[PDB]
């Protein structure tokens, strides 16, 4: 794989080309991007892909140019979605939360990318998407139902003052606050590790290979059992997230609940 | 200062200034990093008098600071995204879950908001990202609906505190436009950051997107208003912000006296205390969550429709388990002693 391919097709449903491209191994890692258009999550998605330092832009694995789109890219069993930056106002936000849901529930770990952390908006769009829920108890193999997804904030494009350990601290204390009730997402309770905030050559790098190894860490398997759900198997979970009534009646009272 | 503790002594502390002529500015932003709300306002009275970030006994409240010199009331608000009101409603009580943590915040910052536009001759909104805040816009959207339902009830209290019939400025408003309200604000903007292409392309901006929510060109369903010709967007540096605000201020004559804006802040009160509105009114997040979960438990009791009443009676636990977030303790408790009802009978 070259560079990243488009997951969905139109009307949202999971690209046909998509199952060809997964391998067949239990040993696999699910890392999604969210965030606003500036932050510039597409470029930094890449570099913990493959990306080195000063490599030419033509050369990046997540290049950003249909309603709703995610980018999917994998290397060595590390399953990369680089979804379309978040936003009538009322579709807009519908949609927003549609693709933050799915992403949610078939990613080991999120990262939630920005320019403005603490966002309470953002946190906001995180604990209702928590709520669009899919019923999959048939599905085979059984699913971890108590599990929780990792959301690690990125604070990108900061200044100075964004660095200084006493407002890190002060920002991760809202973070962790923010999803202590959760049942579903969870943050680091670690200091540092929940908020990252990067500025903007080989000392940067440093850094994303060093987040690129915490990524592997916190993460909970989508199964009962170790190493049941294979790589195409989690496609087969995908399409039926995108599938289940439940989770499409519980989006459109959301719809309703924001118009009325 | 808390504008409700400010009423009560402001009557005596400018005992000898109650016909001065005086006009009330509103003030919209967020707290950061050694860098406050009013941080520029405090700088055009050159005199730091609100905080760099608001204390907890400070959130969710109007600050109001008179400067006798200038002769303007300005109120800050401190909102929902103060550090110390998300410390404070996340660690009342854990028992609880964050949507109606944050929800009664929510709805004080939207009283607070109704407050200051119908009371302020401008109102400037401070931003620092470059982009225009929508998340506000969408508060001022609920503002404005919930000043058209509650204007009738103001209007009254207007009556009875004996201002209606004094005049906020030279602008004449029929009894449509001012019901409820003393003055339709003039709305300004500053951006914190070839410069006089930026500031056009923002202004179209900021009227478009207020044109979008029906905030502006909507009559008396209006919430705001624009200049016709002075600048309504300022780009600080990183004075030109004096002219901006000067420019503004000074093209409209004082008329409201002292005197009567205590007695205003006085009458406006019901509005922050909330006298007037219908009891147990929830936000849309929280009917969402609650009817989400009132058709999760309606389609649970479907599921368990002899002896393996333990068979059908769990199905059910693992749905719920598996779809409601919040109050699932007491859903799941709930919910059983509904299929137990059901399994006797």
Redesign the interface.
């Given at each position: 794989m070259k560079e990243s391919v488009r997951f969905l097709t139109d009307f949202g449903e999971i690209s046909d080309a998509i199952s060809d491209l997964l391998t067949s191994s239990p040993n696999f890692n699910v890392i999604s991007a969210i965030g606003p258009q500036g932050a510039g999550k597409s470029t930094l998605l890449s570099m913990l892909a493959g990306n080195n330092s000063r490599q030419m832009y033509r050369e990046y694995v997540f290049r950003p140019v249909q309603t709703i789109q995610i980018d999917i890219y994998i290397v060595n069993h590390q399953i990369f979605l680089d979804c379309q930056p978040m936003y009538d106002d009322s579709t807009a936000m519908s949609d927003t939360l549609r693709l933050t849901a799915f992403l949610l529930y078939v990613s080991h770990t999120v990262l939630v990318v920005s320019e403005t952390h603490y966002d309470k908006v953002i946190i906001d769009t995180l604990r209702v998407a928590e709520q669009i829920r899919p019923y999959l108890a048939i599905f085979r193999p059984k699913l971890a139902i108590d599990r929780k997804t990792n959301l690690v904030f990125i604070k990108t494009k900061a200044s100075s003052i964004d660095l200084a350990p006493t407002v890190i601290r002060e920002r991760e204390e809202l973070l962790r606050l923010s999803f202590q009730d959760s049942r579903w997402l969870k943050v680091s309770q670690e200091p540092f590790k929940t908020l990252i905030v990067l500025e903007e050559l080989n000392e940067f790098d440093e850094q994303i290979a060093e987040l690129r190894e915490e990524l592997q860490k916190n993460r909970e398997d989508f199964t009962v059992e170790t190493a049941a759900m294979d790589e195409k198997k989690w496609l087969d979970m995908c399409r039926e997230v995108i599938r289940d009534k439940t989770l499409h009646k519980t989006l459109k009272e959301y719809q309703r609940a924001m118009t009325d | 200062m808390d504008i409700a503790k400010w009423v009560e002594h402001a009557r005596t502390c400018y005992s000898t200034q109650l016909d001065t002529k005086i006009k009330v500015i509103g003030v919209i932003g967020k707290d950061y990093?050694?860098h406050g709300k009013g941080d520029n306002i405090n700088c055009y009275l050159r005199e730091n008098v609100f905080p760099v970030a608001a204390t907890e006994d400070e959130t969710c409240t109007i600050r109001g600071h008179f400067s006798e010199d200038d002769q303007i009331l300005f109120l800050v608000m401190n909102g929902?995204?103060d550090?110390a009101n998300?410390?404070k409603c996340?660690?009342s009580n854990?028992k609880?879950?964050?949507?109606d943590a944050?929800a009664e915040s929510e709805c004080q910052q939207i009283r607070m908001l109704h407050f200051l536009f119908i009371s302020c001759h401008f109102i400037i909104i401070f931003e620092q990202?470059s982009?225009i805040d929508?998340?506000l816009m969408?508060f001022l959207k609920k503002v404005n609906s919930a000043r058209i339902q509650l204007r009738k009830k103001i209007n009254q209290r207007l009556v009875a505190s004996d201002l209606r019939d004094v005049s906020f400025n030279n602008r004449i408003l029929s009894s449509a436009e001012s019901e409820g309200r003393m003055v339709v604000p003039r709305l300004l903007i500053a951006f914190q950051r070839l410069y006089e292409k930026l500031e056009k392309n923002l202004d179209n901006q900021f009227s478009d997107i207020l044109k979008?929510y029906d905030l502006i060109d909507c009559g008396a369903s209006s919430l705001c208003q624009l200049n016709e010709t002075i600048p309504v967007v300022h780009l600080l540096n990183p004075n030109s912000f004096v002219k901006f605000l000067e420019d503004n201020f000074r093209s409209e004559k004082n008329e409201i006296s002292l005197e009567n804006v205590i007695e205003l802040m006085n009458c406006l009160q019901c509005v922050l205390d909330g006298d007037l509105e219908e009891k147990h009114e929830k936000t849309?997040?929280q009917?969402?969550?609650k009817?989400?979960q009132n058709?999760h438990m309606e389609?649970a009791r479907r599921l368990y429709t002899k002896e393996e009443h333990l068979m059908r009676f769990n199905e059910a636990t693992?749905?719920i388990?598996?779809?409601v977030?919040?109050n699932?303790r007491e859903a799941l408790s709930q919910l059983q002693a509904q299929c137990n009802e059901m399994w006797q009978s």
């Open positions: - | 990093p050694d929902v995204d550090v998300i410390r996340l660690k854990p609880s879950n964050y949507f944050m990202t982009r929508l998340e969408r979008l849309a997040i009917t969402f969550i009817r989400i058709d389609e693992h749905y388990d598996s779809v977030g919040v699932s």
